[PDB]
Ligand binder design. Structure first.
Ligand code: SAH
Lengths: 160, 8
């Protein structure tokens, strides 16, 4: 196959997983020191779709509004995932408890998943792709990407 | 007291 053909096939596969919201090959566990985490129940291969980071897709005005509210309730955790798309700031706000798994994945700078922006007809999605083969039984991890001094002072596990 | 997630 050509590069265009393989890319076209990958896009179709990914669009369809985003539609179904199918989250196979994963389960929730408790991981010492982290809270809940998500562990693989099957081997994933490098390059595979793992899960969408699924939540409320919002723009900056609402994101800033919600941040100001969440900061007032300390039982609210940190589930807002910011990105740029078409010169604008977007956020997948996964603060609300749902059954979706992406929002439960913990942080490592040396993890096994990589977040990508995947556009379907001008709607952006954040998806996690396996950055290496992932063993059955191992925790899914990705780099949260907040390196700010203010964050790491308060959340030193961000440093690694 | 809150951190974010940011795409890089
Ligand atoms: N490497 C890590 N070490 C310690 N805590 C972590 C971590 N990665 C994520 N966390 C925790 O997970 C939060 C992000 S939400 C991820 C799911 C969460 N563990 C839960 O039980 O709901 C962080 O703010 C922090 O509390």
């Amino acid at each position: 196959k050509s590069k265009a053909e393989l890319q076209s096939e990958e896009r179709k596969r990914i669009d369809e997983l985003i539609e179904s919201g199918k989250e196979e090959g994963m389960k929730i566990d408790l991981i010492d020191g982290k809270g809940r985490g998500v562990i693989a129940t099957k081997q994933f291969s490098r390059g595979d779709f793992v899960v969408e980071y699924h939540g409320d897709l919002i723009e900056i005005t609402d994101a800033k509004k919600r941040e100001a509210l969440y900061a007032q309730d300390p039982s609210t955790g940190c589930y807002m995932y910011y990105f740029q798309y078409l010169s604008k700031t977007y956020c997948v706000d996964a603060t609300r408890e749902t059954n979706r798994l992406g929002r439960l994945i913990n942080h490592s700078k040396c993890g096994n998943c990589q977040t990508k922006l995947h556009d379907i007809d001008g709607v952006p999605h954040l998806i996690l792709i396996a950055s290496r083969d992932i063993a059955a039984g191992e925790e899914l991890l990705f780099d949260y990407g907040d390196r700010s001094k203010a964050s790491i002072e308060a959340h030193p596990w961000l440093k690694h | 007291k809150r951190h974010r997630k940011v795409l890089r």
